[PDB]
Design a protein around this nucleic acid. Sequence first.
RNA 1: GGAUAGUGGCCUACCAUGGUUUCAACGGGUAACGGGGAAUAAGGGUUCGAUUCCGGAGAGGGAGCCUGAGAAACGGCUACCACAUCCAAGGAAGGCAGCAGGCGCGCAAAUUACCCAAUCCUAAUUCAGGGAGGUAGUGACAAUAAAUAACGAUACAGGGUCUUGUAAUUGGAAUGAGUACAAUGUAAAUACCUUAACGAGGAACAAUUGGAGGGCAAGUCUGGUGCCAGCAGCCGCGGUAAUUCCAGCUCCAAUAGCGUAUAUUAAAGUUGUUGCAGUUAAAAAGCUCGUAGUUGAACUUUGGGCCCGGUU
RNA 2: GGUGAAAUUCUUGGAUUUAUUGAAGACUAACUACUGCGAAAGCAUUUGCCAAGGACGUUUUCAUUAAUCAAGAACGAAAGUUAGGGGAUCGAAGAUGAUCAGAUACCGUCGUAGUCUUAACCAUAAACUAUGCCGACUAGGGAUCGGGUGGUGUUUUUUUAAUGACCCACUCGGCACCUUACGAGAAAUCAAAGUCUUUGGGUUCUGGGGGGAGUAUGGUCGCAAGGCUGAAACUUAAAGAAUUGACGGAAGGGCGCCCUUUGUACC
Lengths: 144, 29, 35, 150, 129
Amino acid sequence: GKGKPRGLNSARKLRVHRRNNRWAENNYKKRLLGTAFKSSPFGGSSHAKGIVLEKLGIESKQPNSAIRKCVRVQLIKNGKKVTAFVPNDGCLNFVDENDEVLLAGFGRKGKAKGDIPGVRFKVVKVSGVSLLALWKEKKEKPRS
Amino acid sequence: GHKSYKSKHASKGALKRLYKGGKPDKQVS
Amino acid sequence: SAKSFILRKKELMKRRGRKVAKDSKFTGRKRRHRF
Amino acid sequence: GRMHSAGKGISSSAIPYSRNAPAWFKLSSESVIEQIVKYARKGLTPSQIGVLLRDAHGVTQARVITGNKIMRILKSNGLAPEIPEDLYYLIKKAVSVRKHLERNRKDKDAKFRLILIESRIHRLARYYRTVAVLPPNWKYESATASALVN
Amino acid sequence: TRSSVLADALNAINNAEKTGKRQVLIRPSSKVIIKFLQVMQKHGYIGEFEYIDDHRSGKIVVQLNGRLNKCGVISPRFNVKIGDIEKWTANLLPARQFGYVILTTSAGIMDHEEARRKHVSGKILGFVY
RNA sequence: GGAUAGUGGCCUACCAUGGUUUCAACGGGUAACGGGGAAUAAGGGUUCGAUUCCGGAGAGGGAGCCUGAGAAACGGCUACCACAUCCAAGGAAGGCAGCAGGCGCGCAAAUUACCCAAUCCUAAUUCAGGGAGGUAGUGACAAUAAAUAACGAUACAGGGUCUUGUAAUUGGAAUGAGUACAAUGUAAAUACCUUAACGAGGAACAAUUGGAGGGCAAGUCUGGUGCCAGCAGCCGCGGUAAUUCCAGCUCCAAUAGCGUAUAUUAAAGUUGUUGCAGUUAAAAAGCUCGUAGUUGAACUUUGGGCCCGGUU
RNA sequence: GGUGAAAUUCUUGGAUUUAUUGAAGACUAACUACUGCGAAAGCAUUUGCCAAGGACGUUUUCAUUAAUCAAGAACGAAAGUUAGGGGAUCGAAGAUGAUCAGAUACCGUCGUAGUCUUAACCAUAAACUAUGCCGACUAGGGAUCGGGUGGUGUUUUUUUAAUGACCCACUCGGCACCUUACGAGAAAUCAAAGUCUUUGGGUUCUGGGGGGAGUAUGGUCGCAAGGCUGAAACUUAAAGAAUUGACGGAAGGGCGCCCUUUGUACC
């Protein structure tokens, strides 16, 4: 029983049925439709670079407020315009418009640490130096 | 309470109640 | 809503029978600041 | 179970556990075979000959008394028909139900029954042309089947 | 239809051993079923089987003795090289010392350990422990 | 028959009407050179292979060709095509997917260095030539080994006369990271191996990176800030969808490395051949026939005796 | 007539109602069951004709002729489409009325298509046992349908023989049921949903979190309605089985307060 062919000479049916089934996966279908090369905002890339369009104050709530905001950036190689969560406070005095930031992915979303509705990108570098050293006062952002 | 009628894609009658109330594709070489 | 989530979800483990460290002014905050 | 039905019956015959010599028979072997060939000289099929020799003359089964099958006996004397008996009866039933279907056009269950009978006929004809009893095509079809059966 | 009579025979043995009966009646018989039960009896996992001979296919009646956990068939009869026969026992035997998987080789129908001893392999037929 | 080095529809004349296909032909996609291999360790598998070896193709796109044993060669030619150089305006010269390097594209990648000394190749040939190749510079791709401290005495705390812990207490020892006579090393140098001499008293010669409700290891820590139609009254308390608003102390893990992003693999039995499920959680065609496909009852030399020699 | 109430409606040419008779088309109550038949949808008056089936019985015949099934084919509830026929009832659409706080009592009357049949189309349903088909084994019991076997068993012959019907025992094949857990399962529950981490009898189909979405596009079938096949970007951490209760304006008692029974989401 058990639904499937089990005969010694029925390998062709097993292969074809498995091929259609594997097409009904998710990782496999994303890999062979090649949407990382056609529909993904990054070109299948891990990091990317972009020119900062503008910045918008997507704030949690009103006067009693937790200040976690995001920028609007435009990619260079693709031209698609996305949103990026800048790290810890005070760095928006550091990044302005048109600074050629370097972006990555964000990661997990749980109860905390950023539950922003539809922001999967974090600004890793700004002006081609960093955010960590430029927040820990190791290096300084050069002018233009 | 009644158990809700279960289906994957919504039934045609409920589709009627909800709805009442071009160019070809591309294949780049 | 870190305080409400943690204080609600640390009581369910008390019913399930597991140890939970007692709360103070150190639990519901950014323990580590971001970049 | 049945080939084209939902039934699962087992009504059949059970051949006795004896390969020789009914004690009270004690009659002959050649008298039996001349009765067989004379009954076939009337023009009866092997099954009716078997049931008559069982019902009238004490022949239990012809495989043990004569040592040979009935159809092989008729083949030995050249009385074997052009088509075998089961295919002949299937063709006759198909002809009758078809005639009913030209007479009564709306009878859908009879259409389904005709389809069942013709699938049975095609399967049996495939078996016969496999074992080289029929001509290797033999081509059952609607019309000449009437001229085939009678 | 009865595609594998060895499967139905071993399934009847398994059911009647699990429910605790003393005798098992098996229909139809075969050369392969007879050899399988000689393997079982020579290893002692069953009792005493006697073959009732009518002209159709025969029947078997076997005396069980307990002492038998599970027997079954592997279907289809996979071609089994000797270099991976250990894989097969590591697939479905509880331990490495007891329990037997049964092979049909050109030297006959025989359990796995004397298949090591004779250094001959073949098709896999079933298992018993 | 022509042609080829040679068989051959490779080409031509004549004459037949054939060849492939559900065992999926033909067409399309490939961000596809193929393989030896690589990552993932219960087995089976999933994913990758532009890349140190082997085979193929190409020198900006096509085509043609000379020489020659070997080329449809490009560090050879001719022609067109796309770029594009020098000017005396008439004409001439071009091909870095060789080595360096530059521009551009980008998340993404080194010196316009030295040498034929090694490995080998070419030639008229031990001798010449070789950005083939070797050496060095840049180099936290990856991989191996292990310095940042060790031993006492004192005074206490102990386990309690034998054994540990603390101290703005004290003592001499030991040595490489570096600085370098020299010599090895090398085509010549740099570096390693060796070593005359110098080189440790902590802000010395100072180790970081992540974290601290649970996963999952470590806070019944500290301080400051914005607000309150709530108490008090100018001291303050508490609360603060502040998703902690900001900093410090202490602790945990890993450690010359640590974190992050993406992709993939395992734990995953969410691809299930091993090994999934289908009454109600996703999922049994409305029903039957039927072609290819898959699968298909039992039965034919068994049993017994003989010897011999092989392994424990 | 009609409703909780009214109105539209018919009527002194007599409405409603009683009786006699006729005409039409549709459907076969009660018998009607935890019963039968059919591949399923489905099938209920009598008789006749035609062909077909299943089970049982068989000391008949062939000797593997079979099981499941992409392509392909037949049928397929109701609804719907094109001509013809018929048009009693019911009746989408439509016409008219009261619209009276509440309709907890959102309706009344008339009424086209349809409902019925012929000759053609369409091929879908909660088409459901929400349980593919074939084969094997595993547990007690009582009923019931069809066939068969045995009874110096019962009853009706007008003399007690056949048959019919009933009773007892058995057997084959069914539709169903009560209990159990040897076993299974997440649980409700299951003689199969058992013989499964001790996992392999044969074989078709289908599913891979929820939305987007049965959408868009392509192809094909269809006169139409529509059917068959059918993605993606994007977005999200969510979306079956039981028990348990706050809550009660559930009610019933007592002597405003207590005690018992009581059912626990869509828009």
